[PDB]
């Protein structure tokens, strides 16, 4: 168990995405740092091919648990920490209802000293004029909370979740999250009990930056283990 090591001080983090949603083709930039000793991660993301082709908060959930805190006695079953410094994939399925399909696949580790996520993202089935594809969702975001599963068969971990973005007219837009996540290397990983992550986000804009962006600052904290 090294991994956790690299985690006891602020770390610098890389985040890249490349996606095609229903043709449209954009990239995505984002730089930061994380914290885990507070569950702290601060993030800002630039459109680098332009505007953005769907709404920035649908992408926050694909835009690094490893930087969440795990309490003293769940350390054990920290799972992101010990697949580092080789890293995990992580992919997902995302399901927005009445609507398209993201899925994304990710690379999480680190490049030098750098914590990188490195993303791709295809989206497919969306209607052209529907909330995502029409922009008709509010800038903001929720707490939430994400239970995480041992998947023993492939010596990694699951989740599925809800998240719930507000759309312009009062509705709610779901997005159903499945999640499998696998080492990259060979050595040793920690496989863990039932327990949960509670994530909370929050988006903000940078008044002097004229470029498509967004700025997101996430706490973590992982909980529901007894002693």
């Not at 985040?15 to 740092?33: A, I, Q, T, W, Y």
């Not at 997902?92 to 996520?117: C, H, M, P, Q, W």
């Not at 327990?195 to 967004?214: F, G, I, Q, T």
């Amino acid at each position: 168990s090294k991994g956790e090591e690299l985690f006891t001080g602020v770390v610098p983090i890389l985040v890249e995405l490349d996606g095609d949603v229903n043709g449209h083709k954009f990239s995505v930039r984002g730089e930061g740092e994380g914290d885990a000793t507070n569950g702290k991660l601060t993030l800002k993301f630039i459109c680098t091919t332009g505007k953005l082709p769907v709404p920035w908060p649908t992408l926050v959930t694909t835009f690094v648990a490893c930087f969440s805190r795990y309490p003293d006695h769940m350390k054990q079953h920290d799972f992101f920490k010990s697949a580092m410094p080789e890293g995990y994939v992580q992919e997902r399925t995302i399901s927005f209802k009445d609507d398209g399909t993201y899925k994304t696949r990710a690379e999480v580790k680190f490049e030098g000293d750098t914590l990188v996520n490195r993303i791709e993202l295809k989206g497919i089935d969306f209607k052209e004029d529907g909330n995502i594809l029409g922009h008709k969702l509010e800038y903001n975001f929720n707490c939430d909370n994400v239970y995480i599963t041992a998947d023993k068969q492939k010596n990694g971990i699951k989740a599925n979740f809800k998240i719930r973005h507000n759309v312009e007219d009062g509705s709610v837009q779901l997005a159903d999250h499945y999640q499998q996540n696998t080492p990259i290397g060979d050595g040793p990983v920690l496989l863990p009990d039932n327990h949960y992550l509670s994530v909370c986000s929050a988006l903000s804009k940078d008044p002097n930056e004229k470029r498509d962006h967004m700025v997101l600052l996430q706490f973590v904290t992982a909980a529901g283990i007894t002693h």
